[PDB]
């Protein structure tokens, strides 16, 4: 019904080509009913730093979000601060001041193609996310076990219904259907 979904996009140097990542967003978002009283969406991108592409309450319509999403530019990154990205989506994106609706389910979708440089506090961050009831769906572009394990751990139990594997940027799309319904 009503969920506040924050998408955490990896935009580090390694991600390529950006267009595939955005197509992934399009397909995913277009299947949704966005609205102040519907599904809300906010997008966060990370690399060396983190930036709030757009807040949870920025757009009141699905096309407004669909259009804003496609306008997102890759900011690159010599590092992959996955930990920072998720923590930022948690401590910031999900605050009432940025459109976090009171008492509404909080859902986070993470997409990345590399071992975070902040492996250390990824444990802590995912932890804080659990304490705050944030459903987490993670996706790993394998374009590998130590990596796959890192990402699955970012997902919520049951790992299997919250984790997605992809061969490369391109195949991301071939998951939006399952991802979409899994988050239902």
């Amino acid at each position, epitope marked *: 019904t009503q969920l506040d979904i924050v998408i955490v996009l990896d935009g*580090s*140097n*390694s991600i*390529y*080509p*950006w267009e595939s990542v955005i197509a992934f967003l399009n397909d995913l978002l277009k299947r949704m009913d966005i609205g102040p009283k519907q599904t809300q969406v906010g997008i966060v991108q990370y*690399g*060396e730093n983190v930036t709030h592409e757009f807040n949870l309450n920025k757009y009141s319509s699905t096309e407004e979000v669909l259009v804003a999403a496609n306008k997102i530019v*890759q*900011r*690159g*990154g*010599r*590092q*992959t601060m996955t930990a920072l990205g998720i923590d930022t989506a948690r401590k910031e994106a999900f605050t009432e001041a940025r459109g976090a609706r009171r008492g509404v389910k909080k859902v986070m979708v993470i997409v990345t193609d*590399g*071992e975070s*440089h*902040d*492996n*250390y506090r990824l444990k802590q961050v995912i932890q804080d996310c659990e304490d705050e009831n944030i459903q987490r769906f993670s996706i790993a572009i394998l374009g590998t076990e130590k990596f796959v394990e890192e990402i699955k751990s970012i997902a919520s139990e049951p790992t299997e219904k919250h984790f997605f594997n992809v061969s490369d940027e391109l195949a991301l799309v071939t998951i939006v259907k399952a991802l979409g319904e899994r988050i239902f």
Partner: T-cell receptor
Framework: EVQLVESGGGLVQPGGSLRLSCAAS????????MSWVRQAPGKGLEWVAT?????????LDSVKGRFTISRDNSKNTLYLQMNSLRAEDTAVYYC???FGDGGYFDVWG | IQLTQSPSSLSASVGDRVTITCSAS?????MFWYQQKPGKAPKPWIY???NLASGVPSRFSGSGSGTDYTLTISSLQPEDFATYYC?????????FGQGTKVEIKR
């Protein structure tokens, strides 16, 4: 195998310029973030600049604004335009393919 | 982040066990190593801390975490004689250590 073949080195006068090119072959060049690394006479290794598969360029402070890293995926050649060269700049330069966000130097010229 | 290797120089005879230490001013998730032989360009030797490049003979091994990392040659060979550099990618600018030169003690 894979490889980078550099050319463009030489002698320039303090404050002048020059341009190194590096021909890539053996891999899908466009996807990797490439870099330039230098080694001064009797010195170690120094990261000069980097350009991602998407066009983001990065630079060591000392060469910031004096150097320009670019690429032309049409001809899988990487470039390092160097202007306002100073003495500190003298060294042997290596283009380099990177792994991941490019910090690991996969292949060298 | 600054990387300082030790020793900076070391002489050893074939068969000796060598261990280069790379200390970083700040902690990092991994460390990389390059092997440069005189007159040639550096060569990827050990990535992601312990992973050996493609050519690197199995006698080579890398290890570490936080601020202290290490490259080890269990059985020094007359061919392993070159200078090794550790490098980090966790902080900007990316940096190398001063390098550690290893010559054949005969």
């Amino acid at each position: 195998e894979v490889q980078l073949v550099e050319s463009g080195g030489g002698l320039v006068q303090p404050g002048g310029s020059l341009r190194l090119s590096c021909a890539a072959s053996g891999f899908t060049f466009s996807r990797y973030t490439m870099s330039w690394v230098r080694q001064a006479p009797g010195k170690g290794l120094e990261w000069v600049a980097t350009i991602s598969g998407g066009g983001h360029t990065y630079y060591l402070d000392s060469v910031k604004g004096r150097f320009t890293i670019s690429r032309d995926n049409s001809k899988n050649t990487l470039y390092l335009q160097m202007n306002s060269l100073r003495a500190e700049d003298t060294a042997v330069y290596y283009c380099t393919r990177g792994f991941g966000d490019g910090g690991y130097f996969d292949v060298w010229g | 982040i600054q990387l300082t290797q030790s020793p900076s120089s070391l002489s050893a005879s074939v068969g000796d066990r060598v261990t280069i230490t790379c200390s970083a001013s700040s902690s990092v998730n991994h460390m990389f190593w390059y092997q440069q032989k005189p007159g040639k360009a550096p060569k990827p030797w050990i990535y992601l801390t312990s992973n050996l490049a493609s050519g690197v003979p199995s006698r080579f091994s890398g290890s570490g975490s936080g601020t202290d990392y290490t490259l080890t040659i269990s059985s020094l060979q007359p061919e392993d004689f070159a200078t090794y550099y550790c490098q980090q990618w966790s902080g900007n600018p990316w940096t190398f250590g001063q390098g550690t030169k290893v010559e054949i003690k005969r």
